[PDB]
Design a protein around this ligand. Structure first.
Ligand SMILES: O=C[C@@H]1CCCN1C(=O)[C@@H]1CCCN1C(=O)OCc1ccccc1
Length: 682
């Protein structure tokens, strides 16, 4: 093996009188020659280790082959054209097609033509009210930064020069005059690591330069927020601006566009609850909120006096988490029943029309359309059921199959069961276990336990070609709905935030134990996977309980819990993690589980494959660099401690299919090989 030598510096930070050594501090410099050479050496050693796995190629071959099938999205009208995304099978990026009556479908926007390896991706797309102008945002090399392009839809040629410095932004048109978007300002230093916290809302008027765009919110001191958004209602009557400093909680403002220079009225002036616009009807706004409702509710209020004390329930809170979509003149309430979906159709007066029956137990998507759409589309899927499209007739409730999946996976071939286990403190936690029919609970099944746990994020049934290939190889895939998540409302989330964070790691640990106790797998056949916050999860569990698994796979994880907040928009996660500068108690708690600071010399850690990317500006790469250098430094047993740095890729969204395939191939090969397999399972 032999890892690349990683020099240790003399950096020492102090937190409330406590001194902490950070020898790999130089690795935080993403622009230095030393770091670049380091990444290269590391990738080199990883590829050389992987090259030793005989069936690596067979696995990649299998993945690419099963991934290679036609995929198509649901159609949407704009002018005399219906638009729709498609993928011939292995196109690095989905292509947007369009078709008009009496003519063959045509390619409209093909992202693949923008980059050699398809690393440029299309994020947001917003047509002008009349559908003649299209504004759409592109991501370069997987970064959170964006450029908004403007195309004349008819000729498909550029209208104006692209807007720059956009980030975490929507695109919401005010009729056909122009649109609102959000921007920060290029920071001095690397735009892939330097802190940004004064998000701003701008209005770009068509036929003007970007330097002349009016600043709508975020410039004066009283409006300084880390995250701002803007949405103009479908009927162009109200502008809704949201402002937040963290990923949970936001202020909300409304401006009556039907009047000349109307002032901003406060819908919510504190950060004590999340509140978002769904739609309006006349002067009434329809808002989804968790204020005084842990599982959320839909309320209405007259926009001329929108304060929270004036909100009135339209869809009262229930025992299950509520999310609302609108379309065709109806509100569609989606509820979460133990991580699976249920849908109810309501009219704008809060009267329940009917309960919409779904294909099975899994996740639904869709039920989003304009007031005037005569039909709505929804998707259904789960761990063993590839994405299926349905067309919904709103008035009668008629449902018909729009697109059956072309994936080479028979759903009847698998089992995806839900179990509930208990954590250290007694809490009952849900676990969905998927695998190919005919498995035997003899504790020998190669298993991958997946978890996230935080940020009110819910892990609902989701289909993946990678996971389906793992099930085919005979593996088990288990997803735990850990606290910290949003599965059971705000309380579930908060039971996993700040100084309660350890509850999340305890739930994951207890899930691992349940899987062995129930006979699905055993320690040397167990791997744990997690990304971002789920990366912290893997990092925390492997350092606290290195005896628990055989393989650990932390992806783009937050590993230095003491400095995380000093990068990009990490501070935006203070609500969930708290920071080392909050108080000595918070510092101590963070230091107490921070993965980077809990790796210890002499400990035998599992075989690990830390994965990250050179353009991840959500979670700077330095987190994984330092974690990996420390493991290579401190590990004592025989297990490899490797890191795989993806090139020209970011946090995740928009990654080319070719890269996703290579990634999974590397991870599945490494995992089975580290579990001792010399030939593919069977
Ligand atoms: O390549 C396959 C691996 C091994 C088993 C599960 N895998 C996965 O990639 C799973 C399924 C899709 C999301 N996922 C995942 O790990 O996401 C990590 C992530 C989460 C959040 C932000 C960025 C990255």
């Amino acid at each position: 093996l032999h890892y690349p030598v990683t020099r240790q510096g003399e950096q020492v930070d102090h937190y409330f009188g406590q001194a902490v050594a950070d020898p790999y501090r130089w690795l935080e410099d993403d622009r230095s020659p030393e770091t670049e050479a380091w990444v290269k050496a590391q990738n080199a050693v990883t590829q050389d280790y992987l090259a030793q796995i005989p069936y690596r190629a067979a696995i990649k071959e299998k993945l690419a082959a099963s991934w290679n099938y036609a995929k198509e999205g649901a159609p949407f009208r704009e002018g005399r054209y219906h638009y729709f995304f498609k993928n011939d099978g292995l196109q690095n990026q989905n292509v947007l097609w369009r078709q008009q009556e009496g003519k063959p479908a045509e390619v409209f926007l093909d992202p693949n033509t923008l980059s050699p390896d398809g690393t440029t991706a299309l994020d947001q797309l917003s047509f002008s009210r009349d559908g003649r102008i299209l504004a759409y945002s592109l991501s370069l090399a997987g970064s959170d930064w964006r450029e908004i392009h403007l195309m004349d839809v008819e000729s498909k040629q550029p209208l104006e020069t692209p807007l720059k410095d956009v980030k975490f932004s929507g695109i919401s048109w005010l009729g056909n005059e122009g649109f609102f978007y959000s921007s920060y300002d290029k920071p001095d230093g690397s735009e892939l690591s330097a802190r940004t916290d004064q998000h701003k809302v701008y209005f770009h008027r068509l036929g003007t330069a970007q330097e002349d765009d009016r600043l709508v919110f975020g410039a004066i001191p009283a409006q300084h927020h880390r995250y701002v958004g803007a949405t103009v209602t479908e009927d162009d009557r109200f502008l809704l601006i949201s402002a937040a400093n963290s990923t949970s909680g936001n202020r909300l403002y409304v401006k009556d566009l039907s009047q000349e220079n109307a002032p901003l009225l406060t819908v919510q002036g504190d950060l004590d609850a999340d509140v978002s616009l769904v739609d309006n009807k006349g002067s009434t706004l329809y808002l989804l909120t968790n204020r005084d409702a842990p599982n959320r509710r839909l309320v209405t209020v007259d926009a001329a006096n929108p304060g929270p004390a004036h909100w009135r329930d339209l869809i009262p809170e229930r025992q299950q988490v509520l999310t609302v979509h609108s379309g065709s003149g109806y509100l569609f309430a989606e509820y979460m029943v133990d991580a699976t979906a249920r849908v109810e159709q309501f009219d704008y007066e809060g009267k329940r029309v009917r309960e919409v029956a779904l294909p099975g137990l899994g996740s639904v998507s869709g039920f989003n359309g304009k007031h005037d759409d005569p039909a709505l589309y929804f998707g259904f899927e789960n761990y063993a059921q590839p994405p299926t499209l349905y067309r919904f007739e709103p008035k009668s409730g008629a449902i018909s199959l729009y697109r059956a999946s072309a994936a080479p996976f028979k759903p009847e071939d698998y089992v995806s069961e839900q179990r509930f286990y208990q954590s250290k403190d007694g809490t009952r936690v849900p676990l969905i276990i998927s695998y190919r029919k005919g498995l035997k609970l003899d504790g020998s099944n190669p298993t991958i336990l997946y978890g996230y746990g935080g940020f009110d994020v819910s892990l609902t049934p989701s289909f993946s070609v990678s996971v389906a290939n793992w099930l085919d190889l005979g593996g088990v895939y288990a997803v735990a709905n850990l606290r910290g998540g949003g599965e059971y409302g705000q309380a579930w989330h908060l039971a996993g935030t700040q100084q309660n964070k350890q509850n999340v790691f305890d739930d994951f640990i207890a899930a691992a134990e349940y899987l062995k106790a129930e006979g699905y797998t055993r320690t040397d056949r167990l791997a744990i996977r997690g990304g971002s916050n789920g990366g912290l999860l893997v990092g925390a569990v492997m350092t606290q309980r290195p005896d628990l698994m055989r393989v650990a796979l932390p992806a783009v994880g937050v590993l230095d819990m003491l400095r995380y907040h000093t990068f990009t928009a990490g501070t935006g996660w203070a609500y969930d993690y708290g920071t080392s500068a909050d108080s000595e108690a918070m510092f101590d708690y963070l230091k107490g589980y921070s993965p980077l600071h809990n790796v210890r010399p002499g400990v035998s850690y599992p075989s690990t494959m830390v994965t990250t990317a050179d353009h991840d500006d959500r979670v700077v790469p330095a987190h994984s660099f330092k974690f990996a250098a420390t493991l290579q430094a401190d590990n004592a047993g025989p297990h490899p401690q490797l890191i795989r740095i993806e090139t020209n890729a970011g946090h995740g969204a928009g990654t080319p299919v070719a890269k996703l395939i290579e990634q999974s191939a590397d991870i599945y090969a490494f995992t089975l090989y580290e579990m001792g397999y010399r030939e593919l399972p069977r």
